[PDB]
């Protein structure tokens, strides 16, 4: 598209799920982790956060890390309701789209994200009418279950090998331009959306 591109590559942050970084700011204090910023920087994850994001650490020693730097006994399910305030929501519109792409490509997503957040959307955010999850992706490549994140090499080497797919019959939507970047590098075709994007004109004739 004109392209022979075959492949979509979405990614989840952003470009699917609204975020919302001052609510979980603001969650977290309330609980009582009063230095959340110093410790957290989703734009630069550190420690705890790089390593649940790899897979490195489970979700129960995630919520240890974050009793420990908070100096306090915390429930966990009052840990993950802080951290899941992060995400907002999947517009509708996104998963009609998602949807509709299906009958002229096949659909993976490439997200950084950790087993906290995943549950929740899958959970929260792509249940819709009938459908869940997996009716919207061939695959879903999530760098805690990769053991890799976004911007390595390594992590589009791996998704295209494992998929069986051409790099240069696949087009990369991801807001955060240094991925896109980095993808090119293979020979993937990318778009980098703005803000609250809706990039469903990629796709008008
Ligand atoms: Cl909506
Ligand atoms: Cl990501
Ligand atoms: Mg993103």
Same mark, same amino acid.
């Given at each position: &598209?004109?392209?022979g =591109?075959?492949?979509?590559?979405? *990614? !989840?942050?952003?470009? %699917?799920?609204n975020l919302?970084?001052?609510?979980?700011?603001?969650?977290?204090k309330?609980?009582g982790?009063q230095?959340?910023?110093?410790?957290?920087?989703?734009?630069?994850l550190?420690?705890?956060?790089?390593?649940q994001?790899?897979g490195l650490?489970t979700?129960?020693?995630f919520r240890?890390?974050?009793?420990?730097?908070?100096?306090?006994?915390?429930?966990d399910?009052?840990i993950?309701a802080a951290?899941?305030? &992060?995400l907002?929501? =999947?517009?509708?519109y996104?998963? *009609? !789209?998602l949807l509709? %792409?299906?009958?002229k490509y096949?659909v993976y997503?490439?997200?950084?994200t950790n087993?906290?957040?995943?549950?929740?959307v899958c959970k929260?955010?792509?249940?819709?009418?009938?459908?869940?999850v997996?009716?919207?992706?061939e695959?879903?490549?999530?760098?805690?279950?990769?053991?890799?994140?976004?911007?390595?090499?390594?992590?589009?080497?791996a998704?295209?090998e494992?998929?069986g797919?051409?790099?240069?019959?696949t &087009?990369?939507?991801?807001?955060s331009?240094?991925?896109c970047?980095?993808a090119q590098? %293979?020979?993937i075709?990318?778009?980098?959306?703005?803000?609250?994007?809706?990039?469903?004109?990629?796709?008008?004739?």
């Open positions: &598209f004109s392209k =591109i075959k492949n979509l590559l979405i *990614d !989840l942050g952003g470009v %699917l799920i919302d970084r001052e609510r979980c700011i603001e969650n977290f309330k609980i982790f230095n959340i910023e110093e410790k957290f920087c989703t734009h630069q550190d420690g705890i956060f790089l390593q994001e790899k650490i979700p129960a020693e240890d890390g974050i009793r420990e730097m908070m100096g306090k006994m915390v429930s399910k009052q993950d951290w899941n305030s &992060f907002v929501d =999947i517009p509708t996104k998963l *009609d !789209l509709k %792409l299906r009958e096949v997503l490439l997200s950084n087993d906290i957040h995943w549950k929740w929260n955010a792509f249940p819709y009418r009938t459908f869940k997996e009716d919207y992706f695959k879903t490549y999530l760098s805690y279950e990769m053991k890799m994140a976004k911007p390595e090499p390594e992590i589009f080497k998704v295209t494992d998929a797919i051409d790099p240069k019959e &087009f990369f939507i991801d807001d331009e240094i991925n970047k980095v590098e %293979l020979g075709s990318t778009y980098t959306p703005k803000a609250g994007e809706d990039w469903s004109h990629l796709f008008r004739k």
